Amino acid sequence: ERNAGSGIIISDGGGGSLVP
Amino acid sequence: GSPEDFVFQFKGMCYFTNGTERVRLVTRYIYNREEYARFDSDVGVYRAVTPQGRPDAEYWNSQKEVLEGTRAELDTVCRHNYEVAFRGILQRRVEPTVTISPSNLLVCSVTDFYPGQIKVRWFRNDQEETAGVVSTPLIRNGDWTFQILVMLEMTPQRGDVYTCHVEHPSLQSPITVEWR
Amino acid sequence: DIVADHVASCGVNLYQFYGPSGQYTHEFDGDEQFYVDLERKETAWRWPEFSKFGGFDPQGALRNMAVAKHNLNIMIKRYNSTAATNEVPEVTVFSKSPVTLGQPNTLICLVDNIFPPVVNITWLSNGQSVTEGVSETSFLSKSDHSFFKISYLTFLPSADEIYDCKVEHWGLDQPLLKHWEP
Numbered sequence A: 001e002r003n004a005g006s007g008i009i010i011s012d013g014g015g016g017s018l019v020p
Numbered sequence B: 001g002s003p004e005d006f007v008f009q010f011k012g013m014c015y016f017t018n019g020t021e022r023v024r025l026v027t028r029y030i031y032n033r034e035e036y037a038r039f040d041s042d043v044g045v046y047r048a049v050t051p052q053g054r055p056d057a058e059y060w061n062s063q064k065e066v067l068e069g070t071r072a073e074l075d076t077v078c079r080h081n082y083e084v085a086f087r088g089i090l091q092r093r094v095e096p097t098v099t100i101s102p103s104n105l106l107v108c109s110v111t112d113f114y115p116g117q118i119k120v121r122w123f124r125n126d127q128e129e130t131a132g133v134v135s136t137p138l139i140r141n142g143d144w145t146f147q148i149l150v151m152l153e154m155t156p157q158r159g160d161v162y163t164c165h166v167e168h169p170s171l172q173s174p175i176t177v178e179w180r
Numbered sequence C: 001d002i003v004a005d006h007v008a009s010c011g012v013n014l015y016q017f018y019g020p021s022g023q024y025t026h027e028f029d030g031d032e033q034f035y036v037d038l039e040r041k042e043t044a045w046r047w048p049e050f051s052k053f054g055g056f057d058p059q060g061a062l063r064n065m066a067v068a069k070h071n072l073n074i075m076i077k078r079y080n081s082t083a084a085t086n087e088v089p090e091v092t093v094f095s096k097s098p099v100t101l102g103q104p105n106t107l108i109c110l111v112d113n114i115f116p117p118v119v120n121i122t123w124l125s126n127g128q129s130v131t132e133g134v135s136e137t138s139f140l141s142k143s144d145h146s147f148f149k150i151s152y153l154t155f156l157p158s159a160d161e162i163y164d165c166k167v168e169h170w171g172l173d174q175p176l177l178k179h180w181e182p
């Protein structure tokens, strides 16, 4: 009786970053 | 100059063709306006669309539970919602209003109709006019109705009768409005 | 674009760092079926007719927003912290129905090609702000991942009674006043 929504999958994380 | 923004979009997109003869789910993962990863039920696994999606595609495809759940959403989301909502919405009908106004040019404004499938014909006396007819695109009002304007270039003789003729799935037979 | 008879988004999930803020809607053939008020944590209908086509458990939207916040942090890092481009929106104003003086009508302000999804849309009547009779859609999705948004002003057509839709957006150099007259 309810509409269902697609679920967002949890990204792989823990990557480094670079400052622009 | 302006404040900085960083946007994430996730789109769970359901495509239907021939009723439910063909159903396809495409889940899209977007950074700002760039789709970087996606799941396509016709493919059955995640794919990187840009290099930045490669960590997720590899990670997600290694988790059996993730693949099983996403694959099941073709049923639990798309087919399910088609049964709960979209069949009914597809039965929805809102009749168009048809008005003619002059401008030589005649403008037939067809307004406040749903769904978007519609055909507008112009007639001069007992002949359908094809040359000199030009239409706007279908205009989406955002409130679950459309409108459209269809113009006829005319060189009217007195006694000529012009007819705007509108077919639409809400109508048992076409609406006709006359301008003398 | 994928070829199909009908297309639904179940749903459109937006989350952005400015705010931060989010949006959760379902779309069918390009119109908004329902949304989730994330502040009140409840499913709602801008167009209440469509409540007849089933409800929605708002906890699904809230879970997705938590996951989206996480994912956005990660994607900001993966993209060297590249900020959204401010696109230039286009504004169109038109009546919903043929205009007859003294017959209630609705003005439609369409703001298209919105990105990022941050916008001020207001109405002016003879140069003064109008607040009564104004409503608007969600940010409705587009296949190029920009958005449009539509604002509505119920009004009574009259002579010498003119309107502007005033749009503020970071991709404009100054606020845009799009005019309309009966």
Ligand SMILES: *[C@@H]1O[C@H](CO[C@@H]2O[C@@H](C)[C@@H](O)[C@@H](O)[C@@H]2O)[C@@H](O[C@@H]2O[C@H](CO)[C@@H](O[C@@H]3O[C@H](CO)[C@@H](O)[C@H](O)[C@@H]3O)[C@H](O)[C@H]2NC(C)=O)[C@H](O)[C@H]1NC(C)=O
Pocket (backbone or CB within 6 Å): A018, A019, A020, B052, C078, C079, C080
């Ligand atoms: C994330 O950031 C890195 C680093 O980019 C560097 O820092 C930025 C803030 C800018 O100032 C950049 O101009 C600067 O290079 C990006 O990686 C870099 O990518 C470029 C292009 O692929 C690499 O240069 C190439 O090197 C090959 C081999 O020598 C040449 O043949 C090519 O012609 C080209 O010059 C560069 O080596 C690389 N640097 C590092 C440290 O990895 C990265 O692309 C970026 N990611 C995103 C999504 O923007």
Ligand SMILES: *[C@@H]1O[C@H](CO)[C@@H](O[C@@H]2O[C@H](CO)[C@@H](O)[C@H](O)[C@H]2NC(C)=O)[C@H](O)[C@H]1NC(C)=O
Pocket (backbone or CB within 6 Å): C118, C119, C120, C168, C169, C170
């Ligand atoms: C949407 O409207 C708000 C309200 O006017 C804008 O925020 C204002 O921004 C100015 C300039 O930075 C400040 O002086 C005001 O104090 C702000 N007002 C509030 C209530 O915060 C906002 O910038 C608008 N959005 C866009 C994209 O123009």
